Symmetry: D2
Subunit: 230 residues, 4 copies
């Protein structure tokens, strides 16, 4: 199956598969059961920002989520991604909804990779036909230039049981055997609105094998990334 590394903004506590009993950000290494989590003070209706970083000498993957004026949540995990990921990968964003729902709106996205070659892209607006994105599932761009990862209505209300992803078109070379150091950094901003008492399910930035696709049965709590909850 696919090989997945991800940072999850997990809106809904699925304590039956190991989630903590609160909204959380987490670091997922080949399993939906995060190797490290931190409590996330989710704020419906406000734009948030996530920053993600990794360095192969440090061997530490880190993420921070924040909102204007409010305080930040951070999570880190010690890992050597070279013992986890292949040499070439793709990078993307995923989101799901399930029985409960929320908008999974992406307002901007940037990524930089360096191998010692380099790759850098940034979107502050998404076009009507983003030919540099591989859109999977229900993901689509709307009339305002925003990336709606899961289905939203004509008037802006989210739908349940929706899944979608967006991958950057070009593969990324993140290691080699003559390699001295590799790094990446990513940023995205997002807007989550929900009519539900308990919004669900979440948003991820993830890194996978180049031929990755939405797995069978990855809806809801599995965030469009994993085929099961092992």
């Amino acid at each position: 199956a696919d090989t997945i590394v991800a940072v999850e903004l997990d809106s809904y506590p699925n304590t039956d598969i190991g989630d903590p009993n609160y909204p959380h950000i987490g670091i997922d290494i080949k399993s939906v059961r995060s190797k490290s989590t931190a409590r996330w003070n989710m704020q419906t209706g406000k734009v948030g920002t996530v920053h993600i970083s990794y360095n192969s000498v440090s061997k530490r993957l880190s993420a921070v989520v924040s909102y204007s004026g409010s305080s930040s949540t951070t999570v880190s995990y010690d890992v050597d991604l070279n013992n986890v990921l292949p040499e070439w990968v793709r990078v993307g964003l995923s989101a799901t909804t399930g029985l409960y729902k929320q908008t999974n709106t992406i307002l901007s996205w940037s990524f930089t990779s360096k191998l010692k070659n380099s790759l850098h892209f940034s979107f502050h607006k998404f076009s009507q036909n983003p030919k540099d994105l591989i859109l999977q599932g229900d993901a689509s761009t709307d009339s305002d230039g925003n990336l709606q990862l899961t289905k939203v209505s004509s008037s802006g209300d989210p739908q349940g049981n929706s899944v979608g992803r967006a991958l950057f078109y070009a593969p990324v070379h993140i290691w080699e055997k003559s390699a001295v150091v590799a790094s990446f950094d990513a940023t995205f901003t997002f807007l989550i609105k929900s009519p539900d008492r308990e919004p669900a399910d979440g948003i991820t930035f993830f890194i996978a094998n180049t031929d990755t696709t939405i797995p069978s049965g990855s809806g809801g709590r599995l965030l469009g990334l994993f085929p099961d909850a092992n």
Copy 2:
């Protein structure tokens, strides 16, 4: 047929079809018959460097070729590429040999585009299997990490009647209806060695429609870019 904009390093004068009667650099807008040329101050067997720039406010496409800072050649052409290229393009390098030949060896390649969105890539080495490149024709990477656009013997001798290109995998968004300014910059370094008194044929950097392919009959003098010499 493809839509083509290129900067050509034309080592062999094909007066047949409008080449000036000397090795030259040129700017090609939808034709092999350059809109602007300059006599090429060459140094065969030395590493040369090419810098290409364009800005949609200035409406000026420019290139400089130099050899370790010496022996400079420049060419420029006033043009609004918005009325020439489609909104989404691919960018790449091409080269050919013909009856006469030369190595068409790329040692590095970088490109940056900004729309007001941005894309930047840079290769100081080419891997044995570059998954972020679309290799076409005879193009390949060798054991020293160099990109050989045309065929070279296992001992380094160039072969004749060869054609090859390398395209960056992801499409590039160069214009948009509400655009204020768009720009791009490209750099590459090359090594041309030849056993012939009259080496041939040349190297280009080019921009094209995303689905561009080597046209039939585009070898030698046509630089792997055009179907005919109109």
Copy 3:
């Protein structure tokens, strides 16, 4: 006297020293009387954006001003800036008021120089004590993180007969004898509000000798750059 290259956003027509009789953007080379101008559709109270670019192979200095949802104004001038500028410079922003007035509020500023060596800075907020800026005249930063080039009261009301500049602290190496190409790009966003029927005087981005200071007599129509109107 200093040596000045500047892009001016001139809100007030001073027809006795060569201004066209409307608000205009212009390119200034060692004189307040612009080498090139374009009619500027000035919109008080709306945030504007300026992009400026130069390449030494193209030899074209270009600028564009725009507002969200409105048309753009562009101006260009053909020039080899190494005939005008020293090898080392400082880059900066300037603004004035006179009998009539306006706010000269800078919200963000970025600059990139490349010498084929590079320098790049970007500010999206100015700190209360910006130790990487040389503040001259009346320039200061306010509580909102904005750079007020000319004086405003505690209520935000602009004052007349004010002059102010901000220089980036580090000298920039914009030309070098071994260089094959030199380039720079600059962007700023600005907010000009005014209670006057004819607001005045203007904002510039400029490049000057490293020890540039506000010349005596440079108020008002001279934009804080020039000692006279020759």
Copy 4:
């Protein structure tokens, strides 16, 4: 006294003041007695490369030293620089010799810093009179465009008992009250030649209070950074 954070490339084991008994790289937090070290297979006469990285979320400072076709040396250390350094710093390079000696030749240096505002500089050659560096002590640039941190003769032969440093002219803003994440990355390439059987003393990259100067008594084993060995 100054406040110093440094990455040391230490050629000479001074075991009386805490050095391991072999050449080593180390991370120095307000003391020459490194908080973390790694054994360094130093190779005189070959160009080496150092990459340094830090991110305020991961809170890990790391460094890697490599030569062409050799194994790398890595060192890391967990630290929150917000508790160590002031908000505004200068960044620089230092080197010493003592009774024993070596060339401390810097061929290139680059630095990037981001605060969530950004600063980036890169030198692949140094000017013979660099107006954007603060040179201290014996440091100077030569006619080849290399930065000689310690003295060399007309012949290129290094001198003993030398100390020199080079700081980038612009202060850097590495933290603030409302900061969410700060990061930096640095690279330099160096050539250490020596005629001595035990070369000495070393090279550093360092971050300090903006007004830092060479401390009295900082020669030799104190690397031009510290006044004592506590």
